[PDB]
């Protein structure tokens, strides 16, 4: 499984559910579906109100993009941005799942308030290489990885792709 992880804004705008939750207990694998699930205690919901959430589902193995929880602290709150499939919350290795406290304050303001402003019109476009091609004015080119930033890159941790006017989105501060 090879992933191009999404910008936190893209994760918020493409995920049906965005929640804070604590992972409780080990995962249970079912080979009939090919999926495991982790029991979770949801503490806060930012998206996906129509689904009211006790379990999160993901592929059974690493190689098909299964999410494997590495944290041992049961009290640790995690932001989960996932997809609703058959009323079940699904995540993968690519999915934006991160410790809530490990996020920057700008990222927390994004999930709580700001990211939804850029969902309707803007698009974070991932740049695999330089020169990078910009496909429209509503695209913001994400260059964190080419600067070796990854998850901690400046654009993912402090900037949102927000509209300045109809037909034009640019990177903008979140504070």
């Amino acid at each position: 499984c090879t992933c191009v992880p999404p910008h936190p804004q893209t994760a918020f705008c493409n995920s049906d559910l965005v929640i804070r939750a604590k992972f409780v207990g080990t995962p249970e694998v079912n080979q009939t579906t090919g999926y495991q699930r982790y029991e979770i205690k949801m503490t806060k919901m930012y998206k996906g109100f129509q689904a009211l959430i006790r379990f999160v589902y993901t592929p059974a193995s690493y190689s098909v993009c299964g999410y494997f929880h590495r944290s041992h602290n049961r009290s640790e709150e995690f932001l989960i941005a996932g997809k609703l499939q058959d009323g079940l919350l699904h995540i993968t290795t690519c999915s934006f799942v991160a410790p809530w406290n490990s996020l920057s304050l700008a990222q927390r303001r994004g999930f709580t308030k700001t990211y939804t402003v850029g969902c309707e019109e803007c698009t974070v476009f991932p740049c695999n290489s330089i020169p990078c091609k910009l496909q429209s004015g509503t695209h913001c080119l994400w260059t964190d990885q080419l600067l070796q930033g990854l998850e901690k890159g400046f654009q993912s941790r402090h900037l949102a792709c927000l509209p300045r006017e109809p037909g034009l989105c640019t990177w903008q501060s979140l504070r």
Binding site: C1, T2, V4, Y35, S63, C65, C94, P126, S129
Partner: protein, 165 residues
Amino acid sequence: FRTFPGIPKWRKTHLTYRIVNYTPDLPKDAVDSAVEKALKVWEEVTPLTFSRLYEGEADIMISFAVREHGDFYPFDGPGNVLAHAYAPGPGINGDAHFDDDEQWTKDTTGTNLFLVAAHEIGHSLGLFHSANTEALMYPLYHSLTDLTRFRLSQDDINGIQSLYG
């Protein structure tokens, strides 16, 4: 098997692979070149050797597909998941599937087929993901400034050597 729980590995040094379908993103010769270079990456470090089949069922079935394609794990369109593979074993096990909603390239402009294929073939040989960001078995795609100096990391070497020698 003599050890239990079992080692995710092929119980044979010589394996077969077949490129069943192709992506329109590239010439078919470029698809094959990327695949056999991805297999060479593991061949020069291990006793494994690979033979290409053109019909029938091979150990490692390489397929391009979009979204739903007959397994439990549908693709997610452009972005995110670029490909997945299966641990060694019969049937779908050992196969590698590549999301064609990505655009595959010979160079590092778009999504380099060789880089992803070498990772997924690692999974097909029995390797798990690495925590080392420099390792090929790192799950997140890392485009390189030039494929000229692509190196297999020591973590990848040791993992594949502990499996096959």
